[PDB]
Design a binder for this molecule. Structure first.
Ligand SMILES: [Mg+2]
Ligand SMILES: [Mg+2]
Ligand SMILES: [Mg+2]
Ligand SMILES: [Mg+2]
Ligand SMILES: [Mg+2]
Ligand SMILES: [Mg+2]
Ligand SMILES: [Mg+2]
Ligand SMILES: [Mg+2]
Ligand SMILES: [Mg+2]
Ligand SMILES: [Mg+2]
Ligand SMILES: [Mg+2]
Ligand SMILES: [Mg+2]
Ligand SMILES: [Mg+2]
Ligand SMILES: [Mg+2]
Ligand SMILES: [Mg+2]
Ligand SMILES: [Mg+2]
Ligand SMILES: [Mg+2]
Ligand SMILES: [Mg+2]
Ligand SMILES: [Mg+2]
Ligand SMILES: [Mg+2]
Ligand SMILES: [Mg+2]
Ligand SMILES: [Mg+2]
Ligand SMILES: [Mg+2]
Ligand SMILES: [Mg+2]
Ligand SMILES: [Mg+2]
Ligand SMILES: [Mg+2]
Ligand SMILES: [Mg+2]
Ligand SMILES: [Mg+2]
Ligand SMILES: [Mg+2]
Ligand SMILES: [Zn+2]
Lengths: 177, 136, 52, 66, 116, 80
RNA sequence: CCGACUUACCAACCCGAUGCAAACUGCGAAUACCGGAGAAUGUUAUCACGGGAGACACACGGCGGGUGCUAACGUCCGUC
RNA sequence: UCCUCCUAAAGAGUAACGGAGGAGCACGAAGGUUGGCUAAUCCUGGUCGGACAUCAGGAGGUUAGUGCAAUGGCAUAAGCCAGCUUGACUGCGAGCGUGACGGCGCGAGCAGGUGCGAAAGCAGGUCAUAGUGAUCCGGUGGUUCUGAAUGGAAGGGCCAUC
RNA sequence: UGCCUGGCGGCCGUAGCGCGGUGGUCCCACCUGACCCCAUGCCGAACUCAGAAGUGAAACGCCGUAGCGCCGAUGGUAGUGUGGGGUCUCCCCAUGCGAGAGUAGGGAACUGCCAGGCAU
RNA sequence: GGCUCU
RNA sequence: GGUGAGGUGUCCGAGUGGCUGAAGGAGCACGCCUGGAAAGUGUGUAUACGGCAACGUAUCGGGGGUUCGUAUCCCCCCCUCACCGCCA
């Protein structure tokens, strides 16, 4: 809750100032962080899915929800109901603590990190990025690997616009560019 | 030859052709060829009258065709008895009531439209008349 | 018509039986239901037997 | 949260090469020694230097004199 | 949204009691207060009512939106219903779970003498 | 000689409809409407069958009426 | 690799205007039908039970339609 | 032979070697109940990942879904998830519908015993309408009802069923 | 009695959308926290519990507004029952019924029970 | 073992 | 004219929904033996369009459709094979 305290003391004062909001509830806030791993190769075997949920459970200390196909498509050889991915929703303190370990540890552990994009905010403040490789998290041991995965992070916030989320993450010194 | 591309059904009842029409006023263009009689036209009769007015204007001006043949007409072959199913679809017609504007035209003078619609009406079985765009 | 027919014999000692159908290919395991036995006027477990 | 199903999520200490010390809750268990943190990452100076286009005329005039 | 889904969640048993002709106890639940009212089978007029917004009930309490407040309410509405001669009703949860303050209310009304 | 067909079939008429109209005194259990869906709906003292058949639970006169926000058609038995 | 631009070769969606439908309907009659009340009229004309049948090859004409060519003193239905 | 729509003329019904389509099953959960939920498609952003997997938001508002054809229904969902379960109960059944009849159908309610639910209540198979075959003969289990001098038995009857 | 609000209805778009404005004593809402009751096919998101620091931002409610939606005459037209007629695939006459669409126009709902608050 | 033409 | 069956890469040929944008073989292209050819032998073996070559789209006669999915199911048009196209 270190970053939640930093939000509550300095980010709110900053954004109320730089936007001239009438109310403090008018301020943006982060709501949830969603961690998907779309695993389309688990149709070969469940153990690949079973290991991706084990890896992502080490990243965020939650058991992941194994997602399935909403419908059936033949280009990917799937039927409605096949387990095809895994997700984790992070809220509250576990959200903040992951967001701390992210922007403090893992983003520096990216090979050839040179910034993010500010053009990934889906028109309505919610930011989405995707990592190529799970070893940037230090939870994962490098020898203890099975397969180089990749996942994607989706930060869902209460910002109406795109810039209010851009200012919120910049208030958390989020490495755009 | 006008014809629907798809149809929900292949055949249709014979129906009737009673009542007055709806496409009465000259909507789009300035001059119109209005049906007075009653009956059914075809895609051949429509295309022949289109040719006769396109040639009569020397592709000058703009011609609308308000009708469209959407009714299939079946016929049984020669030396076939009256049973054994409905006949095969042979051609397509448009049911014409009195008052139906068949064609419209603008970009040309009135007298040229008169002689064009007269050349077109000589290909049509029904009795027609010439109309103009009425204000209101 | 692969769904063959069976009978659900009372386990109450009576020779009473309900008759019904099942797919023995997809349900190889025996059917056991708790049904009413009108002789004893109790709900008794019936078990699957052959229709014979 | 549920009781048993989630992994152990415990506060540990992570120290770095820049001498940063940060206590986080993690699934590692043991203490952690890092390599780069957000404090010591060369994102704000080094990546700025790391463009390094260089001039073609300046290489030319550098290689000799008329 | 939440209000509408609570109504959708309630409007089956409400229409069922509407065709049953049942005199019906209606609970309404807030984070701060809890409301109760006994409604005639026409659904258009009430008979008795109780709440934690009333002073005579709220002043005896610590917080209006706990289970102890809900039991005091279900007791009061039962004592008013039996004063007016209403004994058998049917409990409408109004889209809430039969749990917590709602369950403590209905258990208090059962204990005071109502029959459902 | 020649021909054939593929369209010779049709099914039997199920004799649906409204058997007792409005203002028409019925006994309890009397079938009012036979229908596929709930083209009509059951109001007071009127039950809905397995096949959406509307029968009278009591005795009295039939009342057709339109209620609800969806303007659905309800059938009720008035008391008499 | 990025493209460069300018055609008239078209064109999705949307919008506006205009038509068509037995197997379309956000509308909707006249009649017909069911039920109730009320006169007048009518040789109970109504219903139930019982005795005896015959008949189950129809025709044209009007209206509403299928089919056929809105062909047939054609054919198949509804109604008089 | 059976089902659905039109023809069919705004009650029912209504023919043709008239126009179009299906059925001769499936399910021990795809039933019951309690609790909860709400689609299609498109737009943007996003690791492998691509027109189309999974993820987040928005438009939209059922254009989806219904075990299968069509029609009528369906948000209180009849649609979708989970828990507990066997009412896919036995004897009856006022009263109606439909048929020339055989027959077919709907059914509140009563008695017994049961499941879910705190309870009111719901449940006598599935959203409904197709998924079927008379009698005879014969087989199996049960039942003393009968038992050709008497006692049994054979056989027959009745109930269930093939 | 006035105003406001909450709950349950009646009615089922003249009642709905949209746009603009506005509300926080109470109420409501968001909101704080969760070891517990209970819950998440992960997650206190929801459900639930314990509360009351903050805000009316959202939501809701109220007020206004004719961009729509909706309603909607009069007259006429279409059709049609009976009777009659013609040039009879279709129409006409007498008489009775009489639309739909469209037009003028209306129109930013109305109302009941209980409870609470502030005023009176 | 057989194994064409130029 | 009707009925029924059918229509596969260069060829023959198997091919009844999911490893069939294709078995297998032949032929063809390339190589080796040979003075040169053949015949032995060995190796490969779709077309177009699209991207940048990641690799993807289309085509089982052609065209439309069910389906998540069609070379395989259904319709249409053609083409062919077989049978019937009669008694007067
Ligand atoms: Mg019609
Ligand atoms: Mg006969
Ligand atoms: Mg006869
Ligand atoms: Mg006749
Ligand atoms: Mg005859
Ligand atoms: Mg006739
Ligand atoms: Mg005729
Ligand atoms: Mg004739
Ligand atoms: Mg006649
Ligand atoms: Mg009818
Ligand atoms: Mg009729
Ligand atoms: Mg179901
Ligand atoms: Mg429910
Ligand atoms: Mg995408
Ligand atoms: Mg069904
Ligand atoms: Mg015999
Ligand atoms: Mg004897
Ligand atoms: Mg004896
Ligand atoms: Mg507003
Ligand atoms: Mg909360
Ligand atoms: Mg506001
Ligand atoms: Mg009028
Ligand atoms: Mg009108
Ligand atoms: Mg309005
Ligand atoms: Mg308004
Ligand atoms: Mg030689
Ligand atoms: Mg030679
Ligand atoms: Mg294929
Ligand atoms: Mg001869
Ligand atoms: Zn560091």
């Amino acid at each position: 809750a270190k970053l939640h305290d930093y939000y509550k003391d300095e980010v709110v004062k900053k954004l109320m100032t730089e936007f001239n909001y009438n109310s403090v509830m008018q301020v943006p806030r982060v709501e949830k962080i969603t961690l998907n791993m779309g695993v389309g190769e688990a149709i070969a075997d469940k153990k690949l899915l079973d290991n991706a949920a084990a890896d992502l459970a080490a990243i965020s200390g939650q058991k992941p929800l194994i997602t399935k196909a909403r419908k059936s498509v033949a280009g990917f050889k799937i039927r409605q109901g096949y387990p095809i991915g895994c997700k984790v929703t992070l809220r509250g303190e576990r959200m903040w603590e992951f967001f701390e370990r992210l922007i403090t540890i893992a983003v520096p552990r990216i090979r050839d990190f040179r910034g993010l994009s500010a053009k990934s905010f889906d028109g309505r403040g919610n930011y989405s990025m995707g990592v190529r490789e799970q070893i940037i998290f230090p939870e994962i041991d490098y020898d203890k690997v099975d397969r180089v995965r990749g996942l994607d992070i989706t930060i869902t916030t209460t910002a109406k616009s795109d810039e209010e989320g851009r200012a919120l993450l910049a208030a958390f010194d989020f490495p755009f560019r | 030859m006008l014809q629907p591309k798809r149809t929900k059904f292949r055949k249709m009842h014979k129906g009737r052709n009673r009542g007055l029409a709806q496409g009465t006023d000259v909507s789009f263009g300035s001059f119109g060829l209005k049906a007075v009689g009653r009956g059914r036209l075809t895609a051949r009769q429509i295309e022949a009258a289109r040719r006769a007015m396109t040639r009569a204007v020397k592709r000058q001006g703009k011609i609308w065709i308000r009708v469209f043949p959407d009714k299939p007409i079946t016929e049984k072959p020669l030396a076939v008895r009256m049973g054994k199913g409905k006949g095969n679809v042979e051609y397509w017609v448009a049911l014409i009531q009195p008052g139906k504007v068949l064609y419209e035209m603008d970009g040309v003078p009135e007298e040229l439209a008169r002689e064009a619609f007269k050349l077109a009406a000589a290909k049509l079985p029904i009795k027609t008349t010439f109309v103009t765009k009425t204000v209101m | 018509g692969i769904r063959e027919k069976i009978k659900l014999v009372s386990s109450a000692g009576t020779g009473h039986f309900y008759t019904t159908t099942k797919n023995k290919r997809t349900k190889p395991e025996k059917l056991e239901l708790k049904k009413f036995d009108p002789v004893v006027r109790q709900h008794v477990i019936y078990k699957e037997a052959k229709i014979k | 949260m549920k009781k048993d199903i989630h992994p152990k999520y415990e506060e540990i200490t992570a120290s770095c090469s820049c001498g940063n010390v940060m206590k986080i809750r993690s699934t590692v268990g043991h203490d952690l020694n890092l390599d780069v943190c957000s404090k010591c990452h060369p994102f704000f100076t080094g990546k700025q230097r790391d463009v390094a286009t260089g001039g073609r005329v300046d290489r030319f005039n550098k290689r000799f004199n008329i | 949204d939440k209000k509408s889904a609570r109504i959708r969640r309630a409007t089956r048993a409400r229409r069922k009691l509407q065709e049953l002709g049942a005199t019906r106890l209606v609970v309404h639940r807030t984070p701060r207060h809890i409301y109760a009212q006994v409604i005639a089978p026409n659904g258009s007029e009430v008979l008795v009512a109780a709440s934690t917004v009333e002073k005579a009930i709220a002043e005896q309490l610590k917080y209006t939106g706990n289970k102890d407040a809900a039991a005091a309410v279900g007791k009061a509405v039962a004592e008013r219903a039996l004063e007016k001669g209403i004994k058998d009703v049917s409990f409408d949860r109004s889209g809430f779970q039969y749990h917590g303050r709602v369950q403590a209310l209905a258990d208090a009304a059962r204990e005071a003498g109502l029959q459902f | 000689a020649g021909g054939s067909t593929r369209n010779g079939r049709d099914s039997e008429a199920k004799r649906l409809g409204v058997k007792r109209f409005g203002g028409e005194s019925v006994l309890a259990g009397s079938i009012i409407v036979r229908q596929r869906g709930t083209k009509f709906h059951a109001g007071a003292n009127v039950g809905c069958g397995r096949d959406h058949t509307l029968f009278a639970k009591a005795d009295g006169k039939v009342k057709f009426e339109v209620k609800g926000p969806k303007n659905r058609k309800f059938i009720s038995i008035e008391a008499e």
